[PDB]
Amino acid sequence: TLPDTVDWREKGCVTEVKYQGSCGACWAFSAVGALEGQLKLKTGKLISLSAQNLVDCSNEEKYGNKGCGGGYMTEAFQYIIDNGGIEADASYPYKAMDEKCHYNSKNRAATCSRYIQLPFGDEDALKEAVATKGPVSVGIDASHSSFFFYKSGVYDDPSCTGNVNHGVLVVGYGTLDGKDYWLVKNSWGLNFGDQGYIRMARNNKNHCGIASYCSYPEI
Numbered sequence: 001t002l003p004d005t006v007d008w009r010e011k012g013c014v015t016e017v018k019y020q021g022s023c024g025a026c027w028a029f030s031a032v033g034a035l036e037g038q039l040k041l042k043t044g045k046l047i048s049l050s051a052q053n054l055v056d057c058s059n060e061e062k063y064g065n066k067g068c069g070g071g072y073m074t075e076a077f078q079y080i081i082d083n084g085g086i087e088a089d090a091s092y093p094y095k096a097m098d099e100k101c102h103y104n105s106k107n108r109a110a111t112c113s114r115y116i117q118l119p120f121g122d123e124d125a126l127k128e129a130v131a132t133k134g135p136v137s138v139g140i141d142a143s144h145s146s147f148f149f150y151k152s153g154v155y156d157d158p159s160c161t162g163n164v165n166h167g168v169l170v171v172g173y174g175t176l177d178g179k180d181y182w183l184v185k186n187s188w189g190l191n192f193g194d195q196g197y198i199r200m201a202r203n204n205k206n207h208c209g210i211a212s213y214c215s216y217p218e219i
């Protein structure tokens with residue numbers, strides 16, 4: 001039986017909200033966010049991991065990531081698996097540009113053995129994973145201006161679609177004033193939403209495609 005409310009921030013499993021700038025690195029922030037959660041759960045250390053390492057080093061046909069042109073959280077995990085590691089943000093900081101890969105194994109801060117994909121559209125499966133596994137990478141339709149107007153409450157825009165376009169991180173869930181929500185960490189800095197987070201409608205027919213393309217890594 002699952003808890004009614006989850007917030008991984010309260011368990012010390014979520015790092016500071018990052019600022020992607022004008023580089024299309026949402027996917028990279030989503031992926032490192034999920035892996036940060038696992039790293040904390042396994043090792044006890046919370047460390048921001050290198051989104052830039054993903055941007056610079058997985059921009060090739062093998063993965064189909066495009067650096068600042070966008071990419072996939074699953075393929076980010078595959079890169080980390082193939083590479084045998086990823087650096088921390090502190091040693092490989094975010095530049096918001098496509099740069100030549102300069103991964104240094106001496107600076108490895110995390111690994112990935114495999115990743116898990118949840119069933120398409122299944123908000124119950126996402127609830128279970130968030131409750132029991134940790135933060136989960138997801139795709140959403142974040143293309144409507146209302147998304148950037150959000151400040152409080154639960155985002156529930158009838159114009160949202162299942163055609164996703166941005167990777168974000170689900171770090172919890174609950175019910176706010178009778179409305180089920182997913183607690184979502186973005187990568188637009190503190191000024192976005194509620195201190196960088198948005199609560200998005202949950203159990204409302206897979207609203208904004210939030211449970212369409214969910215994945216998480218294993219250390």
Ligand SMILES: *C(=N)C1(NC(=O)[C@@H]2C[C@@H](S(=O)(=O)c3ccc(N4CCN(CC)CC4)cc3Cl)CN2C(=O)C2(C(F)(F)F)CC2)CC1
Pocket residue numbers: 023024025026027064065066069070071072073138139140164165166167213
């Ligand atoms: C973030 N700053 C930006 N968005 C992206 O990088 C997104 C993240 C993901 S996604 O969440 O939008 C997405 C889209 C489609 C899938 N598919 C559908 C087709 N299936 C096979 C039939 C496989 C899964 C999964 C996900 Cl996670 C991809 N993003 C992109 O922008 C694209 C690309 F990666 F190619 F760059 C355009 C897809 C950059 C705004």
